[PDB]
Curated annotation (Swiss-Prot), chain A:
The gene is gyrB. It comes from Escherichia coli (strain K12). Consists of 3 domains; the ATPase domain (residues 1-220), the transducer domain (221-392) and the toprim domain (393-804). ATP-binding is cooperative, and both subunits must be wild-type at residue 103 for supercoiling to occur. Non-hydrolyzable ATP analogs (and ATP-binding) induce dimerization and enhance ATPase activity. ATP hydrolysis induces domain shifts that are probably part of the mechanism of DNA cleavage and rejoining. The lineage of its organism: Bacteria, Pseudomonadati, Pseudomonadota, Gammaproteobacteria, Enterobacterales. The chain holds residues 609 to 675 of 804 of the full protein. Coiled coil: none annotated. DNA gyrase negatively supercoils closed circular double-stranded DNA in an ATP-dependent manner to maintain chromosomes in an underwound state. This makes better substrates for topoisomerase 4 (ParC and ParE) which is the main enzyme that unlinks newly replicated chromosomes in E.coli. Gyrase catalyzes the interconversion of other topological isomers of double-stranded DNA rings, including catenanes. Relaxes negatively supercoiled DNA in an ATP-independent manner. It is found in: Cytoplasm. Belongs to the type II topoisomerase family. Heterotetramer, composed of two GyrA and two GyrB chains. In the heterotetramer, GyrA contains the active site tyrosine that forms a transient covalent intermediate with the DNA, while GyrB binds cofactors and catalyzes ATP hydrolysis. It comes from the Bacteria. This is DNA gyrase subunit B. When the enzyme transiently cleaves DNA a phosphotyrosine bond is formed between GyrA and DNA in an ATP-independent manner. In the presence of quinolones this intermediate can be trapped and is used as an indicator of drug toxicity.
Swiss-Prot record, chain B:
The lineage of its organism: Bacteria, Pseudomonadati, Pseudomonadota, Gammaproteobacteria, Enterobacterales. When the enzyme transiently cleaves DNA a phosphotyrosine bond is formed between GyrA and DNA. In the presence of quinolones this intermediate can be trapped and is used as an indicator of drug toxicity. The enzyme-DNA intermediate is also the target of a number of topoisomerase poisons, including toxin CcdB. It is found in: Cytoplasm. A type II topoisomerase that negatively supercoils closed circular double-stranded (ds) DNA in an ATP-dependent manner to maintain chromosomes in an underwound state. This makes better substrates for topoisomerase IV (ParC and ParE) which is the main enzyme that unlinks newly replicated chromosomes in E.coli. Gyrase catalyzes the interconversion of other topological isomers of dsDNA rings, including catenanes. Relaxes negatively supercoiled DNA in an ATP-independent manner. Negative supercoiling favors strand separation, and DNA replication, transcription, recombination and repair, all of which involve strand separation. Type II topoisomerases break and join 2 DNA strands simultaneously in an ATP-dependent manner. Signal peptide: none annotated. The chain holds residues 490 to 538 of 875 of the full protein. It comes from the Bacteria. This is DNA gyrase subunit A. Belongs to the type II topoisomerase GyrA/ParC subunit family. An N-terminal fragment (residues 1-523) can be reconstituted with GyrB, but the complex no longer has negative supercoiling or ATP-independent DNA relaxation activities, although it is capable of DNA cleavage; ATP-dependent relaxation is inhibited by novobiocin and non-hydrolyzable ATP analogs. The fragment has ATP-dependent DNA relaxation and 30-fold improved decatenation activities, unlike holoenzyme it preferentially binds supercoiled DNA. The C-terminal domain (CTD, approximately residues 535-841) contains 6 tandemly repeated subdomains known as blades, each of which is composed of a 4-stranded antiparallel beta-sheet. The blades form a circular-shaped beta-pinwheel fold arranged in a spiral around a screw axis, to which DNA probably binds, inducing strong positive superhelicity (about 0.8 links/protein). Heterotetramer, composed of two GyrA and two GyrB chains. In the heterotetramer, GyrA contains the active site tyrosine that forms a transient covalent intermediate with the DNA, while GyrB binds cofactors and catalyzes ATP hydrolysis. Can form a 2:2 complex with toxin CcdB in which GyrA is inactive; rejuvenation of GyrA(2)CcdB(2) is effected by CcdA.
Length: 67, 49
């Protein structure tokens, strides 16, 4: 997250900047992997403020987890 | 092939565990019972005249 572009609160409702941001982050993570992990992404839509919270999924040692 | 799937990993782990069990198994020494009762000291003395 240090080298990726900063994501601001005002960008949490576009639903398009978030998708590209998370896709770039996941691609960068998958590019440099050296321990056998796999990375995927998902976008969550909230019905309260029409926000779009990013979701990151990873499979390590055969175990799936969502962050 | 091993790195591609998790079922293969679980099979390897299971085989290792089974080999360990078959190589270092033994028996049980301690016995387990169920709450042995007490003695009132009167049932140990025969009742007579």
């Amino acid at each position: 997250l240090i080298y990726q572009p900063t994501l601001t609160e005002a960008d949490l409702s576009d639903e398009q900047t978030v998708t590209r941001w998370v896709n770039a982050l996941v691609s960068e993570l998958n590019d440099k992997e050296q321990h056998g992990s796999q990375w995927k992404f998902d976008v969550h839509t909230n019905a309260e403020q029409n926000l779009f919270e990013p979701i990151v999924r990873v499979r390590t040692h055969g175990v799936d987890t969502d962050y | 092939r091993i790195l591609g799937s998790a079922d293969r990993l679980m099979e390897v782990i299971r085989e290792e565990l089974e080999l360990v069990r078959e190589q270092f198994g033994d028996k049980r020494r301690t016995e387990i019972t169920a709450n042995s009762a007490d003695i009132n000291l009167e049932d140990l003395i025969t009742q007579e005249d």
